[PDB]
């Protein structure tokens, strides 16, 4: 068992908004939960885009999840990751 390296990135900056992508990589086994949350509440499926849970080529796997937010609301959003018992919550950089 290998825990993922979670990493949040900010992209597509315009009109006071940004796209925030939560990457989870280098993990095993394949099964994982990854979702953006606003105030600890999981976002709708139709407000997020998911990367497929696919192999690295080193025996481990990677996935991602992204959503659009407003600048000034970063503290309000978190990426929740759960994987083989353990779980964690990751902030948006500002």
């Amino acid at each position, epitope marked *: 068992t290998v825990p993922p390296m979670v990493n949040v990135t900010r992209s597509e900056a315009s009109e006071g908004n940004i796209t925030v992508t939560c990457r989870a990589s280098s993990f095993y086994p394949r099964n994982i939960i990854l979702t953006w949350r606003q105030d600890g509440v999981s976002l709708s499926h139709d407000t997020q885009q998911w*990367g*497929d849970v696919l*192999p690295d080529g080193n025996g481990t796997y990677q996935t991602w999840v992204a959503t659009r937010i407003s600048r000034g609301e970063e503290q309000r959003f978190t990426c929740y990751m759960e994987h083989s018992g353990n779980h964690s919550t990751h902030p948006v950089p500002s």
Partner: antibody
Amino acid sequence: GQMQQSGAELVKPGASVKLSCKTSGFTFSDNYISWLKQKPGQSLEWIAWIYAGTGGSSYNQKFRDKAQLTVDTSSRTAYMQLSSLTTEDSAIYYCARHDYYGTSGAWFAYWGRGTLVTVSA
Amino acid sequence: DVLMTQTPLSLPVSLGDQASISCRSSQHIVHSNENTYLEWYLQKPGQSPKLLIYKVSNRFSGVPDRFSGSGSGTDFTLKISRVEAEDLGVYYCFQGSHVPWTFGGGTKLEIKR
């Protein structure tokens, strides 16, 4: 972006050749680079992919001893080394990328123009 | 291996007519992550293959809505609702679900004029 493949190669039987796929206009490290084989007037085969971010790879077992994929992050360029060439290795060889973040689960979303390899004495 | 059989091998169709191509796999192609990586490509003459459809039914960016993909189990179909002249070329189905990944034999679309 762009995916510039090297010009056609003539190579002797038993020799090897290193094909290149020089790229630009996109985040190279966030892409699976696959290599595919097409003999003119026939269908295609998948050889292997390499994820540029990790250098990790998956190989079609048919091309296990044939092909060796590598990636140079600095130059944003992918390489396939083919070795012990026979006449049956004469084909068009394509590099294609899986835009993992832009269109996830689409394996050959953008292609190079192809390098024609002719194996002959 | 997953064998991929297409029908027909050649497909004459009149301009503005509906064309459809079948792709039959020898076994199921649901990846263990529960996606079905069936993809359709069009190779125009003198060009490399171009992506039309991924994961069974998802139209790739730039691809006109006249192109449509569907199916499940071992039975998959690409449909073109109003065939324009630029649609001619060879169509390939592909599975990226089970290693080794495998292409269909190809379906040659010709404009019947």
